[PDB]
């Protein structure tokens, strides 16, 4: 035991399917004795825009603004905005980061994209060197728990949407793997709006049950072959 979990949660509605998946996670991980923290992005009115307000005090170059460089330097100089550093503290302490969100345009909702853009800066999440297998959050686990409008059928290799794995690439590989996370198998709850309550309860239950043994899981091989191969 002694395991710490951050849930980064992106849904506007407490009563939503996403809300229930988040609450089941809190309940089950809490029951196990895990340390659990939730960043409820919409309730926080979390700022998604990458702007020069994310740096407090004097900028590295106040005439030409380069976000990547300014935030790298601000992290090194402990001069990032408190909303960012608050999130970095949560991530730093976590052994597992679970992202709970509805799929928006084959990706995360903008509020959560903004969390990734602003929280995962150079020096904290990655550096030269220290990316992919050697990214700075190595040792940590990340897990995408996604809900969709589309059915599993639509999300097949020859379905209209392609394999669900195809849209996971920028998230699992380009973001989480890049930062050094070992990536647990995604949790994809397909088309809850379409499903019967029976099927919905089953999807929630699968998640709760999965969570019972989450600490015994092996990470996926987060490779192009995993995402795009046969």
Ligand X SMILES: CN(C)c1nc2c(Br)c(Br)c(Br)c(Br)c2[nH]1
Where is the binding site for Zn(2+), in residues? 173, 177, 222
Residue 122 touches which member of ligand FAD, Zn ion, ligand X, none, C-beta under 5-8 Å by kind = ligand X
> How far is C-alpha 144 from the geometric centre of its chain's CA atoms?
6
Q: What is the CA radius of gyration of the chain?
A: 18
- Count CB-CB contacts under 10 A for residue 105: 8
Instruction: Indicate which single residue of 92, 138, 169, 219 sits in contact with its own copies (rule: CB under 8 A).
Output: 169
Minimum gap (Å) between residue 209 Cβ and ligand FAD: 14
What is the x/- site pattern for ligand X, positions 10-49, by CB under 6 A?
----------------------------------------
Residues placed in the known binding site: 11, 17-20, 103-106, 126-128, 147-150, 155, 173, 177, 193, 200, 222
For 57-91, letters b (16+ CB in 10 Å) and e give eebbeeeeeeeeebbbbbbeeebbbebbbebbebb
Say how far apart CA 121 and CA 127 lie, in whole Å: 9
Element (H, E) at 206: helix 197-212
- Contacting positions for ligand FAD (CB under 6 A): 11, 13, 16-18, 20, 50, 66-68, 102-106, 117, 147-150, 174, 192-193, 197, 200-201, 204
């Amino acid at each position: 035991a002694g395991k710490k979990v951050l849930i980064v949660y992106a849904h506007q509605e407490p009563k939503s399917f996403n809300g229930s998946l988040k609450n089941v996670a809190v309940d089950e991980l809490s029951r196990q004795g895990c340390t659990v923290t939730v960043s409820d992005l919409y309730a926080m009115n979390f700022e998604p825009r990458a702007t020069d307000k994310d740096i407090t005090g004097t900028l590295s170059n106040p005439e030409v603004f380069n976000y990547g460089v300014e935030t790298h330097e601000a992290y090194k100089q402990r001069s990032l905005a408190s909303d960012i550093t608050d999130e970095q503290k949560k991530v730093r302490e976590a052994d597992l980061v679970i992202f709970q969100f509805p799929l928006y345009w084959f990706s995360v909702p903008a509020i959560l994209k903004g969390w990734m853009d602003r929280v995962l800066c150079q020096g904290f999440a990655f550096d030269i060197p220290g990316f992919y297998d050697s990214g700075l959050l190595q040792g940590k686990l990340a897990l995408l728990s996604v809900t969709t409008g589309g059915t599993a059928e639509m999300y097949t290799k020859t379905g209209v949407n392609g394999d669900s794995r195809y849209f996971l690439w920028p998230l699992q590989h380009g973001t989480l793997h890049f930062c050094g996370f070992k990536v647990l198998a995604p949790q994809i709850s397909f088309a809850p709006e379409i499903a019967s309550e029976e099927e919905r309860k089953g999807m929630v239950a699968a998640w709760s049950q999965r969570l019972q043994t989450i600490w015994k899981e092996e990470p996926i091989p987060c490779t192009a072959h995993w995402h795009f191969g046969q």
